[PDB]
Amino acid sequence: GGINPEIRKNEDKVVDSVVVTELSKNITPYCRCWRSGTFPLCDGSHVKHNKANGDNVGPLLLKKQ
Amino acid sequence: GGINPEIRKNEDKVVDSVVVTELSKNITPYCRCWRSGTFPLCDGSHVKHNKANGDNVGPLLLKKQ
Numbered sequence: 515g516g517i518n519p520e521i522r523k524n525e526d527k528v529v530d531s532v533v534v535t536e537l538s539k540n541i542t543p544y545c546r547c548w549r550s551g552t553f554p555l556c557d558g559s560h561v562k563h564n565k566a567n568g569d570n571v572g573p574l575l576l577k578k579q
Numbered sequence: 580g581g582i583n584p585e586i587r588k589n590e591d592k593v594v595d596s597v598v599v600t601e602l603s604k605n606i607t608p609y610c611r612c613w614r615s616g617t618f619p620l621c622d623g624s625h626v627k628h629n630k631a632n633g634d635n636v637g638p639l640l641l642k643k644q
């Protein structure tokens with residue numbers, strides 16, 4: 515059971531970096547479900563995923579505090 | 580199918596927050612594969628997962644710059 519159906523299958527290992535001083539919103543959600551249409555950002559696609567599969571995954575929230 | 584077999588299965592949706600000013604080091608990896616024993620941090624478990632499942636997932640790297 516791989517967890518990523520389609521994101522960047524041209525890459526051997528999908529890694530994304532965030533230089534945190536570059537964040538502009540107070541809270542910026544990052545995708546941990548591999549279904550987002552704006553991956554690596556979270557666009558709320560995890561909700562449909564969780565219902566479809568009885569799963570409980572959600573985003574990582576980067577906060578400026 | 581679901582992507583998180585074992586982490587915090589009692590929570591309806593697993594969400595984590597990071598206050599970016601509180602990062603301890605230059606580069607901190609956060610888990611996107613749901614296999615880390617230090618979740619939400621990445622502990623390198625994605626490598627074994629990718630090999631076993633023919634998958635290509637990896638961490639989110641939070642960088643101080």
Ligand code: FES
Nearest residue numbers: 545546547556559
């Ligand atoms: S869209 Fe993937 S965690 Fe929200």
Ligand code: FES
Nearest residue numbers: 610611612621624
């Ligand atoms: S242990 Fe999950 S992405 Fe590294």
Ligand SMILES: [Zn+2]
Nearest residue numbers: 558560561572
């Ligand atoms: Zn949500």
Ligand SMILES: [Zn+2]
Nearest residue numbers: 623625626637
């Ligand atoms: Zn790695």
